[model samples]
Target: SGFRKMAFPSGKVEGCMVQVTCGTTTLNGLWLDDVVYCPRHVICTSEDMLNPNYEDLLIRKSNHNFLVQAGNVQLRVIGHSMQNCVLKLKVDTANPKTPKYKFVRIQPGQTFSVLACYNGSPSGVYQCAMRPNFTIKGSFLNGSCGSVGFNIDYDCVSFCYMHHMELPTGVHAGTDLEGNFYGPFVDRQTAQAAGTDTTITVNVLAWLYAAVINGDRWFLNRFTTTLNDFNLVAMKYNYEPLTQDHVDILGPLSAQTGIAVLDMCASLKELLQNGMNGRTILGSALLEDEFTPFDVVRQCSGVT
Candidate 1:
C-alpha cells in the first residue's frame, strides 16, 4: 500500500536497497520515483526523477542470454528462479515489417531461463535482440521434406538405327523360289560367299546402313540442342538437370525422328528386293564377284 524502507542497527544500511512489494504477496506499487540513501553518504535516486522520459536502462547481465517475442501478440514472461529477476524490456522495431520484443535483466550467472508465450494470433517475425538475431519464420507447406514447386519428371526415348537386315530365302514371307533356290539364299555356301551383290540387294543394304547411322546422329544432335535450351533455363533459376519443360519440348522431335528412321528401314527393304530382281537377270556373273556390278550398285545406293 505504501513505500517501506528497511533499517539496520548500524544506522541506515549503506548501499543496501529494499525491494518494494504490495500487501506481502504481490509486487504492484514499485515505481521509478522512489529514492534511497547509502549511509547518509551517497544518495541514489530513480532515473525517472532525473529524466522523466527515461523509460528503460541498458545493463549487461548474462552472456548469450536475451529475449525474443512476436509482434501483434501478447507475451507472458516467467522466471525460473529467485536469483533470476526481470529488470527492463526493450522492444526492437528496426524491421518495421516484423517487430520483436526483448527483455534485459541482471540475474545470477546460469541461474534462470526465460520463456515467452504469446496471446491471441501471434503473427509477424520474431527474432532475438543480439548482434545477429535468429528469426523463425513459418511456411504454408507443412512437412519435413520442404517445398514442392512446379517440378517435373522427364522421359527420354532411346533411338536406334537398323544396322543389317537378313533376307534368308531370297524373299521374306511370301513367294516360293525354284527348286535350285529352295534352300536359304539358294545355296547357303555360294550365297554366303557372294557377299552382298545383286543390284537390288546391294543398293538396299547400303541405304539401310547409311540411313540408320545418319538418323541416329541426327536425333542425337537435335537432343543436344534441346538439352542446351533446357540448360539455359535451368541456369537462370539455378536449377540443375532437365525438367519437364525440356522433355515436353524435345519429346515430340525425338519421336518424329524415330518414326522417320523406321520408315527409312522399310523403304530400304523394298529397294533391296528390287535390286535382287536385277541380280536375277545378271545371273551368277553378277553375283560371284564384288566387281563393277556390286560397286556400281553400292555407290548408287549411297552406301560408300
Candidate 2:
C-alpha cells in the first residue's frame, strides 16, 4: 500500500451542510451562501419570506406568513408569523446536528444578532438594529392633546401657566409665563435617538415634529399666541400676570365643561380654546366671571 500514492481532498465537513431549527420545529435544506462570520445578522426582505408555491405574504396589521432563511450563520426570519421564533444559528452546514444558537421572536423585519451558541441552545444579544420595523420615531403623539385641560377658567389657565414654569431645573430667566414653560419638552427625533419604550403615545410624537429648518418662524408665533391668550384672559379681569384665586376658577368651570383644571391644553387648546373662550382667538370672549386675581395660590402651588 505504501508504494501506491493516494491522497484525500479535505478534512472539513462535506459542503459545510448543517441542521436548521426554527422555534420548536427542526428544519433542513438551509445552507450557507458565503464565508462564515460567527456573529452575523442579516436582514431578510419580504421576498425572502415568500414560498414559490404559496401566495405572497400580506403586508397588514396582523396577517402574514413565515419565510425563514439562514444567512451568515444567523437564522433570519421574515414576517407573516405571529409568535416569536427562536433561531438556530448554524456553525457548519456539513453535519446534520451542528452547533447552533436560538434567538428573536418571529416578528416582521427583525435581524437578530446571535449572542452565544454552544451545542444546541442559542441566545440573542439585544442590539439597537434588532427592533421592529413598525416603530415610529419622533414628535409627541397627537392623541396626547386630549390630556390637556382647556376649561379656560382661571384654574385651568393658571395651572397650565403655573406648570409651564416646571422647566428643566438649573437657572434661567424670562417672564412669569416664560418661567413656567420649561420642559420635559422632548421632540420625536431626540426621543428616537434616546431610544424609546414601546409604551409611549403617538400624540406626544406629533408634538415633536420639525418646522423644516424654517428657523425662528413658529417659535415667535407660539410666543405670540401664548401671550395673547394670557393677556386676553388677563385683560378681561385686568390681571397683568397669572395669579392664584384666578387659577381656582377651573374647578366649577371644569365640572360644567367636563374639562379638568390639570389637563394639558397646548395642542388641545388650538381645537378647544375658541369654544372654551367662546368662539374667539383674540381671548376677547368672556368664558368666566372675573375671579379676583390676587389670593393665596402660591403656597398651594408651592412657589412659596
Candidate 3:
C-alpha cells in the first residue's frame, strides 16, 4: 500500500489506442423538393356556392379541376377559350357506382354556358375539367342568356315535380340579377370607401344591359351602331343643366326614336313584373313583335 505512490506515470500514452464517442444526430431548416399535379381537384360543397361577384364568370387557360355536389343545387358553368381549346363538364345521376354520365363541351369564344340545376336522392356529381390546362375561379355558366332550356336527363334533375325551377333564369332583379350585377357594381372597394351608394347619371344603361341578357338581341344589334339620338334624350332625363345641342335632335324622327327606346325599357319592366318575359318570349307572336320593336308595347303578355 505504501508502494502505490511510485506507480503513477505522468505524460506517456500508447499511440495505437484512442477514445471514440458516438454523438446523437440533430437537424434544422431542411428543404425538400416537391412535385405538384396540375389538377388540384377542389371539392366544392353546396355551402361553398357563393353569390356571384361578377357577370360572365369564366374559366380560361390555366385553371384547376373542380367537382361540385349536385343535390338540389343551381349553378352556371361557363367556358370560353381565346385559343382553340375545348373544355368539358361531366354530370352523373344514374347508378351510384357507374360511369354513365352526361357531358357538355365548348369551343373557342362561343362563351357557351349552362344554368345547371339538380334535385334528387343519392345526390349526383358535376365535374369541370379541360383537355388542357386553364385558369378557373368561379362557375362560368350563363345565368342570363337563354340559349337552352331545361333537360330532364342532364340539366333539370327531377324537374317534372317542380315546375317553377326555371323561374330564376328569367329577369326578376332578385337573386340572379343582384348576384351578377349589383354585387359587381358594389365590388368597388375604392368607391365604397367614399360612399355606400353609387349613383348613375342615366338609368337607361342598366335597363339596356338587362334587356340584352333577357334575350333582346334585336335592340342590341339595331342600336349598337348609334346611341347618339338616345344619348341626347338621356341627358335631358338626367336633368343636366346643359345646352340645347346636347339634348336636341335634328328632327322629330330621331327624337321619336329616343322616346321609343325609353318606352321599350318600360315595357320590359312590365314583362319582368308579370314573369311573362323570359329568354323565350312565351306568350305569342304579338308579344315577340312588341319585344322586337323600338316602339312601345301596350299589350300584356301571358302563357297562351
Candidate 4:
C-alpha cells in the first residue's frame, strides 16, 4: 500500500484553482525535503514539504498576492525542475462559465510557463484569486517554478491636410508662386483654370521674340495692333519701339544688322498675322535714316 497520508499547509493552494496532477495516483503523503526540492521550490518554499504530493494543492510565493485594485492584470509562471510535471491554471471566481485556464507539461531544461487574462471594463479592477493544487501522483513529476502579475490603462485621437492642387511640370514660363509652374503656355493656362493659379510673367515683345526666333506659328497670330495699341500692345505683347536714345548707344546701322533684320521681320510677321490691317513691314529707308536699337526694333517690330 502507499505511505501514510499527510497534510501540508492550507495556503499551499491559494491564487490558483486548477489541480496539478501526475499520472493516476494522487500525491498526499510524499515528503518535500529542501535539499532535494526543485530550484523553484527552493526559492518559493515556506516550510519543509510535510504532505508533499497534496493533490489539488496550490502554492504561493513571497510577496505574491491578488491585486484587487488593479484595472488590468497579467499572470505568468515558469517550470524549472521536473521534466514531466503537468500544470493546470484557471481564473475561477471571476467568470465560471468561460473559465480562462491552460494545461501544459514541463519539459527538460528551463521551460517557460505563463498565464494571462484581461478584464475589458475600464473601471473594473481584477484580483488573481484562483490557483492550482500540485500533486506528484501518477508517473508525472513536479519542477522549478516562478509567477508574476502586472496592471495597465487605455485612452487615444487622429488628424489630416487637404491639398487640391496638382504638381507642376517645370517647362512653363511662370514661377512656382502658387506651387504650380511647369509645361507649355497652353498647359500652364489649363492648370491655372483648373485652380492652380500659377501664371507665366512674360513681356509681349519677349513672347513675340521667342515665337519669331523659334518660328512658333501659334504665338505669332495671338496679338492685334492699333495706333494707341502701342502701350497696350507693348505691355501685353511686351513690345518697345526704338527711339533716338536707343540708336545713340548701339551705333549707326548699315544695310540693316543681321539680328535687327531678323527681329524686324519676325515682329512684322507676327503683327500682320494677328490681323494688323496697317503696313506692318519696315522699309530700308527707315533702316538707313536712323540706327535701330535692337530693343526698340524688337518692340516696334513687335518681336521681342
Candidate 5:
C-alpha cells in the first residue's frame, strides 16, 4: 500500500529500543535509517556534537561499524544489529575495511556496538561491545517448547537469538497482545497445527507487521533484513540457480503469512512506485502462540 497517508492509530509510532550488552557494560539507542534499508540509529556523542558529522551522523545511516569510537580494538559483534553497529564504526560515517581499528580506544572499560549486516538483515543480533575480547552475538530463533522443538522462523537458527534480542521476550514467545500470558506446551505440532488452538501464537511475528504498518526506517529494516538474510540463502553468488535447499528455506517462510514472496516483491515495487517509507513487514500467522485464552471463548471455556 502507498505509504499510508496516515500511520495506523495515527499520530506517530514509537521507535523500537535496542539494548547492548558487553563485559558488564551496556548502551541503548533508537533505530533510525538515513537514505536506505541498511540499519541505522540516531544518538549523539562528544566527538559528534562538538566536532564532526554530528547531525548527519546521527540522522544519516552508515555502513561502517562504529558510531562513536574511542580507538583501535578487536570486537566480535555476532548478532548485534549492524545498522546501528555500522554507525558505531564510522569516522565521518563510512564503512571502511578495518572499521574497529579507526576508533580511538578509550579506557578498557569503555563501550562499543553488534550484528552482521546481512547484505543487511535483522538476522536480529544487536549489541555494543565495550571492552577488548568483547565477544557478542544473538538472533531471533530462540527456545523450543513445543512437541519436537522448533526454530522461531527460518532465519533464526539459534535459541538465544530470540531470547537475547533488542525486542521484548514476550513478543518472542510469552504473552499475547494487550498482556495475555501463555506458558506450558510440549510440542511444535501441538503449538502449531494442533487439534485445538492452545497457546500457539507469535506476537513477535505480529509485532513485525505492526512495525511494517508504521512504514518508518527502523521497522522497514527489520522486515527487509530478515528477507535479505533469506535471499542470502536463496540467492547464490548473485548468479547460481535456485536449489531445493534454497526453496526449503525460502518457500515456506515467505508464504507463511504477512510475507508472501511475490506480494513482498510487489511491496518493494510499491515503495518505489508509490512512495518510500523503509521497506517491509512481518506476520506471525504461520499456525501461531500463547497466554490467557488460546482462541476466542472456545479454549478459554468452550463458552462459545
Candidate 6:
C-alpha cells in the first residue's frame, strides 16, 4: 500500500491536538514529530500524560531501589475536584542513604509547597552534599467515589554540586533564544524560579526514545547535560523495546495522538534514502544500517 497522511483526532482534519482535562485544569496535548507534549498530571483513574508502558517503567525503577532525590518538592490538588479523595505521599529520605522518612497528605482543596532539605541544619546556600535523597510513593486513601475523580500535581528538584558536574570542554555557557545568559551561576532570581512549581513530567520520556529505543548514548549524553541544573538521572538499564500495543492513542491513561511517530517515521525514511545529503542534522552513525526507522516507529507508535 502507498503512504497517506496519518489520521488521529488531535488535529483539525486528521488532527494532532487534543485537550486533556484533569480535575479542573485542561492541558493541551500535542503530537508533533512522533513526540507527545502534555503536562504530567496524576488524575484519578486517568493517565492523561504518559504512555503507561513508560510510566510503569519509572515506577518499576522505584520498586527496584532506584529513586530520584528531592532538592525541593511541591504537591497540590487540582481545583475542587477532590471532593472525597485523599492522597498519601511517603517520602523516604537519605542522610547517609538510610531510611529516615516523612509522610505527607493531600485532601480536597489543599495547596502548599513541601520543604525537602532546607531550614535548620541544611539551611543557608543549598549545597549538593546537604541535599537529601527522597523517594515519593503515592498511595490512594480514597478514590473520590471514582467519578469526577481527583488530580494531584507534584514537582521536585535534585541538587548537584559544581564539583560533580561533567561538561564537554569549553561549553561553559550558552545563551538561550531569549538572549538570556544562563550558566552554572547561582542568582537570587534563580532561587525564586526554583519555587515556581513545574508540570508535564511525561514529556521527559522523550529521552527514553534516544536511550531505550535508539540506544544512542551520544544523543542521550548531550541531552542530559542540558538538564544538569535539574540534577536528575534515569537508569539506561531497561533496554527492552516497546511494542505497537505499548504505544497507543487517546485512552483514559494513554492520552496521545501518535502523529509524531508517523512524521518521525517519514523523516527517518528520507534519511535512509539520502544518507550523505543532509550531513549536520541527522548526520552519520545516528541510524543503524541493519534496521529501518519505520520498523522502529511502527513498533513504538503503531502509526504504520
Candidate of highest lDDT: 5
Top of the candidates by TM-score: 3
Candidate 1 has its poorest 10 consecutive residues by lDDT at 142-151
lDDT of 4 by residue, 1-304 (tens): 1111111112211232121222222111111111111111222222333333322233432222221111233322222123222122221123222222222222111111112112211111111210111111111112212111111111110000001112243211211112121222221113432222211111223223333344333323333344343334434543334343333433322133323423433454455336444422221111111111332334334341
Please write out the lDDT profile of model 5 over residues 118-232, one tens digit for every residue. 2112223233211111112223342111101011222221111111122222222211111112233111212221121121112223223333444432323223434444334
Tens-digit lDDT track of model 3 for 1-304:
0100011111111100111111211111000011010101111122322432222233322222322222333212222121111112222322232222222332111111122222111111122111111111122222211111111222222100000111122211111110122122222212211112211212223223333433443433322212444445434443222223312321232243344443443443343335343333322222221111111111111111
As a TM-score, model 6 comes out at 0.17
TM-score for each of the candidates: 0.13, 0.16, 0.19, 0.15, 0.18, 0.17
TM-score of 2: 0.16
Model 5 CA lDDT for position 238: 26
Put down candidate 1 lDDT per residue, 1-304, tens digits, no spaces.
1111111121111111122211121111101112110010001133322332212221222211322223332222222111111222222222233212111221111011111111211112111110001111112211111010010112211111000112333321100111111112321112232132122222222223333333322211222234454345334433324444424433333353443322333343333234344333222212211122223233334441
Segments of candidate 3 deviating more than 4 angstroms: 1-42, 46-116, 120-230, 235-304
Q: Give the clashing residue pairs of candidate 6, or none.
A: 10-16, 10-17, 11-15, 11-16, 11-17, 33-260, 34-260, 34-261, 39-200, 40-200
Cα lDDT of model 6 by residue, 181-248, tens digit: 22332211112111111221122233223233433322222121222222222112111222343234
Superior candidate under TM-score, 2 versus 5: 5
Question: What's the best-to-worst order under lDDT?
Answer: 5, 4, 6, 2, 3, 1
Model 2: residues >4 Å from true position, as ranges? 1-209, 212-268, 271-304
RMSD of each: 39.8, 25.6, 30.1, 38.0, 22.5, 22.5
Alpha-carbon deviation at 303 in model 3, angstroms: 18
Better of 1 and 2 by TM-score: 2
User: Which has the higher TM-score value, candidate number 2 or candidate number 4?
Assistant: 2
Q: For candidate 2, lDDT tens digit of each residue in 1-304?
A: 0110111111111223223332232222222232221100111223442221112222221211222333345444322221111122323223333223221122212111111122222221111111122221211221111011001122112111100011122211111111211222321111212122221111111111111111211211232235346445434433333333323543443343343332322333333233433342112232221111111122112231
Q: Is 1 or 5 the stronger prediction by TM-score?
A: 5
